[PDB]
Every structure is written in C-alpha cells, then in structure tokens.
Design a protein around this ligand. Sequence first.
Ligand SMILES: [Zn+2]
Ligand SMILES: [Zn+2]
Ligand SMILES: [Zn+2]
Ligand SMILES: [Zn+2]
Lengths: 60, 60
Amino acid sequence: FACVECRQQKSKCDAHPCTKCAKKNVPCILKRDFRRTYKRARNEAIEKRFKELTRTLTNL
Amino acid sequence: FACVECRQQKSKCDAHPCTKCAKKNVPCILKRDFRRTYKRARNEAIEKRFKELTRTLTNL
DNA sequence: TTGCCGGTACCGGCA
DNA sequence: TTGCCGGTACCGGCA
Ligand SMILES: [Zn+2]
Ligand SMILES: [Zn+2]
Ligand SMILES: [Zn+2]
Ligand SMILES: [Zn+2]
C-alpha cells in the first residue's frame, strides 16, 4: 500500500523505506490505517477557534 | 514592484491586475509596504499557543 | 529592502 | 476505501 508520508502528500509511493522518504530521510511508517491531514483547512479551523477564544477573553 | 498576492507566493509578477491574479481572479492590490506571511511556521505558532491554552483549561 | 527561481508541500479529483 | 496525477501554494535562498 502507501507509506504514511506519501499518503499525506498523496504522492506515488514505492514500498510494499520508500523512495520519497529517502530524499527526506524520515521515518517511513506503514500504518495501513493512516489518513492524511488536510493541513490547510485544518489550521484554518484552529485559527478560527483560536480567535473565538480572544473574543471570549475580552469578555471574562 | 510586486502585487500583494505574488509577493506572498514569491512569484514573478507582471504589473507596474497582474497575470497570476488573473488565473486566480482576485483583488490584485499594490501595497508597496506589504510583506508575505510565512503560513507554515505561523500556523505552527498558533497551534502551539493554542495548545498551551488547553493545558491551562485542564488547570483552572 | 525586495523580486523570483528552483524545489517541496498540499490537494481536488478521478479513477 | 485508497493510490496518485496534474496543478497550486509555499519558501529557502541568491541575488
Ligand atoms: Zn512512500
Ligand atoms: Zn515512505
Ligand atoms: Zn502579480
Ligand atoms: Zn496581482
């Protein structure tokens, strides 16, 4: 299947340490139950929720 | 000089609406005093600071 | 102080 | 329930 890192970048993975994880020299894990993180949107949520906090601090 | 958007992506900008801002159809502002945001690192800070908050909630 | 190249990081979709 | 292309978004540096 696909290595954790490749799954994240959705890049072709040559395992079953994968090639890409080479150029990066990182822990090439094989977690068949891993699902990439949608960084962008994610951090968007965070920053949004983080904001609410301040508008809460300015009210307590 | 460079349009706000191009500065952000540090891409060649053809203004002085720029080309890129076309393919994107966005507000091609010319803010000579604008400086890109280092998204990555930035959101990193946010998420880190955001974290401290929870370890503070679990203590108040 | 500021423009952009060359090179990853991310992702919308389409299988 | 996934692998990955094709196309941006981001940036480390080098001017
Ligand atoms: Zn891989
Ligand atoms: Zn790998
Ligand atoms: Zn531009
Ligand atoms: Zn522009």
